[PDB]
Paper text:
[name] exhibits the highest potency among the V3/N332gp120 bNAbs described to date. To better understand the molecular mechanism underlying [name]’s interactions with [name] glycans and increased potency compared with other V3/N332gp120 bNAbs, we determined the crystal structures of natively glycosylated clade A ([name]) and clade B (B41) Envs in complex with [name] Fab. We found that [name] binds the V3/N332gp120 glycan site in a distinct manner relative to PGT121-like bNAbs, primarily through rearrangements in its VH and VL domains. Analysis of [name] interactions bound to a natively glycosylated [name] showed engagement with oligomannose glycans near the base of the V3-loop and the conserved GDIR peptide motif.
We solved the structures of [name]-[name]-35O22, [name]-B41-35O22, and [name]-[name]-[name] complexes to resolutions of 4.1, 4.9, and 6.7 Å, respectively by molecular replacement using synchrotron radiation datasets. The [name]-[name]-35O22, [name]-B41-35O22, and [name]-[name]-[name] structures each comprised an [name] trimer bound to three [name] Fabs and three 35O22 or [name] Fabs, with ordered electron density corresponding to native glycans at the Fab interfaces. Modeling of oligomannose N-linked glycans into ordered electron density was also possible in the 4.9 Å [name]-B41-35O22 structure, and for the N332gp120 glycan in the 6.7 Å [name]-[name]-[name] structure. The orientations of [name] Fab with respect to gp120 were preserved across the three crystal structures and a low-resolution EM structure of a [name]-[name] complex, indicating that the orientation was conserved across different [name] strains and was not an artifact of crystal packing. The demonstration that two [name]-1 [name] trimers ([name] and B41) can be crystallized in different crystal packing lattices without converting their glycans to exclusively high-mannose forms provides an impetus for further crystallization efforts using natively glycosylated [name]-1 Envs.
Residue numbers in the entry:
A (entry chain A), B (entry chain B), C (entry chain C): 518 to 547, 569 to 664
D (entry chain G): 31 to 140, 152 to 185, 187 to 309, 312 to 321, 321A, 322 to 398, 411 to 505
E (entry chain H): 191 to 243
Amino acid sequence: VFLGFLGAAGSTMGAASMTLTVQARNLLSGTVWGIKQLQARVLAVERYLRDQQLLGIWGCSGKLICCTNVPWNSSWSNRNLSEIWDNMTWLQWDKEISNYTQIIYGLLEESQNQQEKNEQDLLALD
Amino acid sequence: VFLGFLGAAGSTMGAASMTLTVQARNLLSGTVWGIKQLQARVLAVERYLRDQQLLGIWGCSGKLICCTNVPWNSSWSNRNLSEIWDNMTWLQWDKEISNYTQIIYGLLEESQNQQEKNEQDLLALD
Amino acid sequence: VFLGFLGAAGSTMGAASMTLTVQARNLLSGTVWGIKQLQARVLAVERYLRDQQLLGIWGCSGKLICCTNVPWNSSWSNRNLSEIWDNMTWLQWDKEISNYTQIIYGLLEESQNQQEKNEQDLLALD
Amino acid sequence: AENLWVTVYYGVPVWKDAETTLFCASDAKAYETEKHNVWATHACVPTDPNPQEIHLENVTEEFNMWKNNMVEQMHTDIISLWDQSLKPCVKLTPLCVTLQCTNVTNNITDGELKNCSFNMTTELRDKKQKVYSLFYRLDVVQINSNKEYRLINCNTSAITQACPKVSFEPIPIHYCAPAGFAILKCKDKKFNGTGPCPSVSTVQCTHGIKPVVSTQLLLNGSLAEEEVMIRSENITNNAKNILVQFNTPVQINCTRPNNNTRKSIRIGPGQAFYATGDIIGDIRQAHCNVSKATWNETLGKVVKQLRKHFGNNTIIRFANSSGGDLEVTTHSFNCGGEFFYCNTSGLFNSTWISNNDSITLPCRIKQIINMWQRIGQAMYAPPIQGVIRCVSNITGLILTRDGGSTNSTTETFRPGGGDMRDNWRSELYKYKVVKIEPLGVAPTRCKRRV
Amino acid sequence: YRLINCNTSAITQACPKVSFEPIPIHYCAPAGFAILKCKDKKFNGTGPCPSVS
């Protein structure tokens, strides 16, 4: 059963974290009456290089999955684990972080690799 | 021995995996008529990005050398290793993959890193 | 403290190299007259991806701050670690490295990772 | 041990054959002919002042002087170059009026030109202009008493006048690949145009050629090496136009020996016309002189490589072109801003079996032309103040042959060709395009960690 | 009389639709370049600035 591209749309987050090489493989994928092509393609790598940009500055670089060393600040709508992975989808998840992801995202970058990668130049030297 | 860019185009593959970086220099080399260069340097990243994305998903991430975990299932161009790396150049052997190079990579990105990057958080939940 | 962008120019090298995760966030983000901005951004990523390759065709693979195994030759403004690293500013320290930064990277890919990651190969094929 | 694997190396010397878009280079001293862009240099990157050439060994590739698609792009590059170097300047629509033409102001001793009158619109709109000019018998045709002519193109299309600064003598240029692509050169001496080339080098930037609009002959370009070149598309097909690359250079020196005068004609508002003023003094016709020594040996050198292309014992004949248009019967080439057409009869005229001074050819001065078969555009080349001269190493040739004939007894060879695509094949036989694919693959015996 | 460009030039009338009041514009720079601004007030142009911005 190979459900296609984003075929794990309305399925559990765990199952929808399987095909991480399906919604990221073809995000690059290897006169007039021609302005159309040369215009639209200038947007393909703008919303792809942004991802090749952000993973590198997080604790990621290596593609697909990669964890972080940051406190999940419990001011966010924290929920029970058997009520998250066991049952939620990647389409119901992102609707919640909507109202405050502009306050939420100022951490992974501002906190972890700003210090958890400055514990490495508080490691390697003397 | 250092004989320049593409200087080892047709010698033994052992002597040809030497200069892996000089060919990694001129993949990016940095009204009207200005259109003649603007549509040319656009296709410099296009010869680089294709491999930046492929190696990133893989166990390569970085460039140059990169081992992989794909069995050369003997139905492919089964050869002696001396008949690959000792008696052939890059041209003489990339000839042999061509019969099956459209089959080898239903694996490297599709059967390796699709699954070998989701046991990194069923294992890493300790 | 999250001051802003690049206030530490006449400030010490560590206080400069402190915020290694601030300057890399807003560079991509996500007819005529519509052409001068167009000729600006495609020559603003060919150089960026020239860097994406260099961090991979060396041994670093990842992103941020990598150290090297190169003779910081004595002719290059030698003060102590504490009279360079724990003392000076990139206004007063970059004023001393400039005239000979072209000799340092006549090597950064030549006799090392070109031959080094190939030493990984003549090793791992027998 | 022995069960093979898949091992990745990036930056491998591996490429593929594909065709795409290069970008211009043009030295930095060739940057200096200007004239509001002679050809195309604007934001163009100047040639890397020393275009590094990297010699290759154990490298093979099939080159071709026929299906090559660098001929394809080049043949429409120079068309629109010509088009865009024309399309903001002066229209000459009021110049499609009947011209009173009569044997030119001389004391006879025929003349070829005529002293021709007409009306014209000046700066003010309502008042017209009595003024006369001088045209060649090819610039006008008799539409139907003193012989009445029109501009020969009125029966066809609309025309234009060039901005007079544009210098038309060909200018050297180089060719560079952006990154991700490279350029290969076929540095061999006996290359039969089909099959494996013997010697390849690669560059980011190539040599310098000149856009020489020359039918029949080739000049200003690239000589051959050692024994004179006898190339063909396929040596058993006479309907294909045949190309030659000389080894010995034949030195030419075309000249229009008439101190020309240029007239300022107000035909606006703003617009102007540069008319052919009165020729200063003695009357001579344009021509091209050629040295006798180097021609006599281009005979014997070329000849003995043709008995190597058909029969060691036969008879070989040369004759001129029987008829068509002046581009193929005469030598078509721009000399100093205007196009010359020299009667090529004295050359194609010889008989060959198994075993101090100068000469010249008479050339017609042509100013209006409808070249490049760009159906819709002919135009007028502005007059050229002063005496014109133009020299060049004669370099190539286009010609044909007969049919079945009496076999082994004899055979004829005549000039023609014309189509500017086989002229681009005189330099493009040794150039093709590649794209770089740095990600190779190999089965060693190794693997990566979990 | 005649119009004055007639002894020299051609001429074109603009559209009366197009208005011509000065409207502000910001000049921009992409990934790799920027524009400096020395915040000196008593600034006679030449030299290093004490509190460069």
